[PDB]
Structure formats: C-alpha cells, structure tokens
Amino acid sequence: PIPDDISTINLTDPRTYEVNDLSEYWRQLRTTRPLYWHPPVGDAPGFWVVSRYADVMALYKDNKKLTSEKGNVLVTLLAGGDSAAGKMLAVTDGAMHRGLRNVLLKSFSPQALKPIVDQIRVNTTRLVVDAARRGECDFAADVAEQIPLNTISDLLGVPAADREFLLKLNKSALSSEDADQSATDAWLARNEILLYFSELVAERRAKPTEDVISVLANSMVDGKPLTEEVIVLNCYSLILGGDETSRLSMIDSVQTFTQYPDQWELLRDGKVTLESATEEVLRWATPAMHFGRRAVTDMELHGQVIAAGDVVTLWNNSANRDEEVFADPYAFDLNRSPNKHITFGYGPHFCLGAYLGRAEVHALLDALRTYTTGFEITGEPQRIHSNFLTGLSRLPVRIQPNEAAIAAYDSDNGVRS
Amino acid sequence: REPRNETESRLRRIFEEVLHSEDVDVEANFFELGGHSLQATKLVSRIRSEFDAELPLRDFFEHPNVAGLAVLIGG
Ligand code: HEM
Numbered sequence A: 001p002i003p004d005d006i007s008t009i010n011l012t013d014p015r016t017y018e019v020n021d022l023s024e025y026w027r028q029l030r031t032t033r034p035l036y037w038h039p040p041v042g043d044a045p046g047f048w049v050v051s052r053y054a055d056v057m058a059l060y061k062d063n064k065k066l067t068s069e070k071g072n073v074l075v076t077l078l079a080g081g082d083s084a085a086g087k088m089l090a091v092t093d094g095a096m097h098r099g100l101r102n103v104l105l106k107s108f109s110p111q112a113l114k115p116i117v118d119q120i121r122v123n124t125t126r127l128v129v130d131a132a133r134r135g136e137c138d139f140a141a142d143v144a145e146q147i148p149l150n151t152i153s154d155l156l157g158v159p160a161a162d163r164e165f166l167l168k169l170n171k172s173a174l175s176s177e178d179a180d181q182s183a184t185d186a187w188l189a190r191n192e193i194l195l196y197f198s199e200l201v202a203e204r205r206a207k208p209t210e211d212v213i214s215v216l217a218n219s220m221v222d223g224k225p226l227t228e229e230v231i232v233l234n235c236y237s238l239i240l241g242g243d244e245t246s247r248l249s250m251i252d253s254v255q256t257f258t259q260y261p262d263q264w265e266l267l268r269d270g271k272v273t274l275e276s277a278t279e280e281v282l283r284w285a286t287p288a289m290h291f292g293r294r295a296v297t298d299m300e301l302h303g304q305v306i307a308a309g310d311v312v313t314l315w316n317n318s319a320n321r322d323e324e325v326f327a328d329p330y331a332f333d334l335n336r337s338p339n340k341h342i343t344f345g346y347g348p349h350f351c352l353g354a355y356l357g358r359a360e361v362h363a364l365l366d367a368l369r370t371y372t373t374g375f376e377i378t379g380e381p382q383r384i385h386s387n388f389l390t391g392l393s394r395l396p397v398r399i400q401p402n403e404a405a406i407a408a409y410d411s412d413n414g415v416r417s
Numbered sequence B: 001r002e003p004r005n006e007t008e009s010r011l012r013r014i015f016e017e018v019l020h021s022e023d024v025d026v027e028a029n030f031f032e033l034g035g036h037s038l039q040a041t042k043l044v045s046r047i048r049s050e051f052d053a054e055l056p057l058r059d060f061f062e063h064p065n066v067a068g069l070a071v072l073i074g075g
C-alpha cells in the first residue's frame, strides 16, 4: 500500500513501517520538502525530518551546531534526553568523545580485529553448512542469531553460558517481536543488561583478563581511569550495537536474494566480488532507519531556520534511495559502483564497528556462495516492530546444498582432526 | 516524613547516596524524583547485596519507593 499524503504518516509509530510502503513518501519529501517538520504526537514534541543524502551527510558531520548529548534516536530525543549522556560514546560529544573513541579504537580498528575475522569466518561457515545439511531451517534463529552476538561477546569477554540470556534482552530493548510492546518491558530489558554488566565489570576490574572490558578497565582518558559506570554503559552499547543491526543485515540478504535470483547467481558463480556485494547488501538493508541530533545553536537550511533545542532526525533509509546519488536506487545491484551508502553514518560518530559489521556480512556471503546452490522461503517471515530498526526476527527457508563443496569441507576437517 | 523501621531507614539512606541528594521522601516515586537507569542499576544491586535478597527488577519497578520496597523485603 502506497500513501500520497504526507500529514497522515506518523513516523514515531512502529506500525507505520509495517502497513505502509514509504518509498513514495520519502521521494515526495526528498523533492518537495527536504527539511520537513513532523508535528507533535501525543506527549512527544515535533522534530525535523531530513531525507536527502547530501543533507543527511552534512548534518552527521556537524558536531558543532548539533549535538548527540540529548540522545541520538527518537525514543531518547523525544523524551528530552539520554540518561547516559556524556558517558556512553554515542551520546557524548567533544573531548570526552575523542578520548573514549581513541581507547575503543585500540580494540575495534581493522588492525586489531584481524585475528577475530578468522573466527567469524570459521563460525559462519560451520553454521551455514549445518543449515544446508538439514535443508529446512529458520535462517534467523539457526544461522544469523548465532554470529554477531557471539563475536562481540568473545571480544567483550562474556561467558558462553550467559549469551542466550543476553539475546532475549536485546530483542526487547529498542525493537519488539510482538505488536504492542509497552515501554515497561523495554525499560526492564535495557536495565537488565546494565545489571548484568555491572556484575561482570566488577569481576574484571578485580581480576583482569585480556578482553575488551579489561582493556577499558585499565585505560585512561584525560589522565584518569574510567569509572565502572562508564564501562558498563559502553558495554551496553557494544552488546546491543554489535548484535541487532548486523543480524538484520544478514537476514535481509537471504530474503532479498530470493526476490532477486539474478543477483544471487552473480554471487554464486563468482561474477561479483564479496566486497562489492557486501556494500549493496548494506545499502539495501539499511537496518538502522534513522539517527538523530539536537541543535545547540540556530542554523539555516533550505531557507528554513532550525532553532536551538530542535530535534533533528536523519533518515539513512531515505538517503540510500536518493536518485541524485544512486542511479536506479530501488534496484538491487551487487555490481553497484561507486556505492557510497550512509548505512554506517558519517563524521565524528561514524560506526565504530563498521569493519566488524562488514566482516560478518562478508563471511556470510562467502559461506552462502560456496556451500549453497540456492534457497527459497517456506513460511511467513516475521517483521520486527520499531521506529528505529527495520528487518525480520524469523525467516523460514529451504536450502539446496552444494554437495561437492560440503564433502570437500568434511574431508578437509577429517585430516585436520 | 521519617522512616518507620530499620528497613525503611536503611533503604532511604541508599536512595540518598544513589540520587546524590538529601531530603528523599520515603513515599515518593523513584521516577518522579528524576530517577533514571544509571541510578536504578546501582540502587537494585545495592539493595540485593545489603539485604541479602534476590529482588527482581520487575518488583522494583512496580513499587519504586522506600515504603513499598521495605514491605517486599520484609517477607
Ligand atoms: C551493519 C550493521 C551496523 C549498522 C547498520 C550500524 C550503524 C551505525 C550508525 C549509523 C552509527 C552512527 C550513529 C550516530 O551517528 O549517532 C553507528 C555508530 C556506532 N556503532 Fe554501529 N552499525 C552496525 C554495526 C555495529 C557493530 C558490529 C558494532 C560493534 C562494535 C557497532 C557499534 C557502534 C558504536 C559503539 C557506535 C557509536 C560510535 C560513536 O559514537 O562514535 N555497530 N552505527
């Protein structure tokens, strides 16, 4: 279903993204009102909506006239702030942000993540071969859910036995699997993550290991150690940040490939590089639909004045379908070059796990093209509900295995045993 | 208003240290006093360790006040 009017669409409601195809809505905003004022809804204030790639890029870059210290997603921005402001990386600006990012780059740089990449490739291969042997599986639960969380947990130093518990909590923090989730259940889930990590951080400061929590606990910003509170809040943003979005991208690729069998064949038959295909998967899926800022000073854009205190939302989903930047934007094209998508954001807050997210998708696509000849959707897919995230929580598939490649994989493991 | 037993008195003292303020009402709601997640985390984990009680987070949310928590603890 396609809406022609702009005023009817309420972007704060998660139901909006289920019942409607907003492709026409975003096009209309992009061409006729690039800076649109979304009206107040209930107790929530109004907010600016930015839809053009160029404007989205320009506002991500400006950390001087815009700030993240009042929140960076709708739920925090419309509440008037984020409790973790100035402590959690994503909601910190200025010197504290630069220092805190610099200590995290010791762990999340391409240079530091290389040994981890090997583990991602091994785990992903193993899971894909399992699913291919069975034939009939649920790609979300049996493959996708078992990679991103496990990766970030290994880095953080989360005990294996607590990981299933953490996945349940993540699935309630910013998005629900059920239609009408109250703010209570989400609050409980978010704080349960905080309660878990305050126990684990206390354990790691008392007895340090070599994981990221230990690296943070022994790091310094501005000549002073990080408080346990600051470490816990960042752990929250890593466990949830390194989980949902990657997971959704991986699920979306499998669904998209069934819709675009010509592009699956290009990947299967080695007619496109994994690097090129990973970028189109990321442009297509855009699992984080929006991020946001708040104006600290007055600014003019397209003749309209954005006042100090105004909530400004940047829509990555709209930016990745801009005709001015992407030729045939609603075409899924693995050969797309250049592919300067804004899925990982831009500027000072550019995704800290961009390399890690890319490595996870890359490993999946490599495993799918090697040990699979094709796949098909068998049941009704299940959409997550959110004004922030987009994707599926469940995807029933039948996988046709590449039997020769699986036999070679088994023979290889036989002599390595 | 003053705390009416050892449990209420001990709990109010925890509220004060967590919220960084004196004059904490024993009957007032935690969230109406500007209480957030960071403070809630420290609060619950401190109540658990000092009262040797496995207080669920849901129980804290349903009765986020000194008086209510004291009733739930004493049982
Ligand atoms: C493909 C999946 C991913 C997507 C779509 C994505 C998206 C984004 C975006 C758009 C931002 C910018 C936020 C802003 O400007 O306010 C961001 C930042 C961030 N991301 Fe991701 N991300 C992904 C994977 C990951 C992974 C694997 C991690 C684990 C390390 C992670 C952790 C973070 C953190 C900690 C920030 C805050 C950076 C800062 O404030 O400087 N993300 N992400």
Ligand SMILES: *P(=O)(O)OCC(C)(C)[C@@H](O)C(=O)NCCC(=O)NCCSC(=O)c1c[nH]cn1
Pocket (backbone or CB within 6 Å): A073, A075, A076, A082, A083, A084, A088, A090, A174, A187, A190, A191, A233, A236, A237, A240, A241, A242, A245, A351, B035, B036, B037, B038
């Ligand atoms: P309480 O007072 O309710 O506060 C909880 C908490 C301290 C966690 C607070 O910061 C909050 O409410 N945050 C909102 C949830 C949130 O913003 N999570 C991070 C979004 S996922 C994300 O940014 C990302 C980036 N890359 C991948 N994923």
